[PDB]
């Protein structure tokens, strides 16, 4: 359930 | 589920023009809340989002001066930009992104705005 | 920074032909095991709507002549068999790399 930080998005 | 957009079609230049989107159907405090630009022909630009914890991203280009907001009694958003230009003549789409797809996939009508005296 | 480059502008399908459309991406748009391109259609007088999402995915409500496929930089949306409702400007997005950016677009024109 990927979330979104500065553009990019990543796990947890 | 429906993004209603509201605001002025007319703006002068080097005045701030302010857009809302309002939501029905599911709360903001999920998803991600993004403003999208059409040019007069035909280009498309992102601007930007609102997340549901109420942070924002922004375009770099446009990070001078944008701002996105919201308000989640009223469970709208809406969208700041500031020192505006002949150049910012454009169609302004609200949009939102869920994790079931990670795009862009519920957008608004637009909002035909030209900058003019 | 990162450029997306669509190929062709403009394409010129009969009906019931096969359409490809090409985005390029200058960097990966990739991230843990998906493809962060997806596929628009826009007509004129509406807003875009989503064809493809994570590269190869078919959004509901959308026709299964539509495909998506590639990886990394290279990403392609078919159409097949083409059909005349499938006049418009085609756009492909990524959402993964600062900053976030649209194809410059293809216009699809169908040839009668």
């Known amino acids: 359930q990927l979330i979104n930080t500065n553009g990019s998005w990543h796990i947890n | 589920q429906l993004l209603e957009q509201s605001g002025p079609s007319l703006v002068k230049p080097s005045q701030t023009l302010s857009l809302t989107c309002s939501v029905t159907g599911d709360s903001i405090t999920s998803g991600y809340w993004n403003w999208i630009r059409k040019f007069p022909g035909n280009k498309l630009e992102y601007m930007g989002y609102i997340s549901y914890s109420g942070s924002t991203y922004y375009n770099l280009s446009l990070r001078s001066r944008i701002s996105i907001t919201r308000d989640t009694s009223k469970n709208q958003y809406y969208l700041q930009l500031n020192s505006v230009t002949t150049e910012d003549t454009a169609t302004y789409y609200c949009?939102?992104?869920?994790?079931?797809?990670?795009?862009?996939?519920?957008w608004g009508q637009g909002t035909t705005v030209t900058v003019s005296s | 920074e990162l450029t997306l480059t669509q190929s062709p502008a403009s394409l010129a399908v009969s009906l019931g032909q096969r359409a490809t459309i090409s985005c390029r991406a200058s960097?990966?748009?990739?991230?843990?095991?998906?493809?962060?391109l997806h596929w628009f259609q826009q007509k004129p007088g509406q807003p875009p709507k989503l064809l493809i999402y994570?590269?190869?995915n078919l959004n509901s409500g959308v026709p299964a002549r539509f495909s998506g496929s590639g990886s990394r930089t290279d990403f392609t949306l078919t159409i097949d068999p083409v059909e005349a409702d499938d006049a418009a400007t085609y756009y492909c997005?990524?959402?993964?790399?600062?900053?976030?950016?649209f194809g410059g677009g293809t216009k699809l024109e169908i040839k009668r």
């Open positions: 997005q990524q959402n993964n790399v600062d900053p976030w950016t």
């Open positions: 949009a939102l992104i869920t994790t079931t797809t990670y795009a862009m996939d519920y």
């Open positions: 994570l590269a190869s």
């Open positions: 960097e990966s748009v990739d991230g843990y095991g998906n493809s962060f």
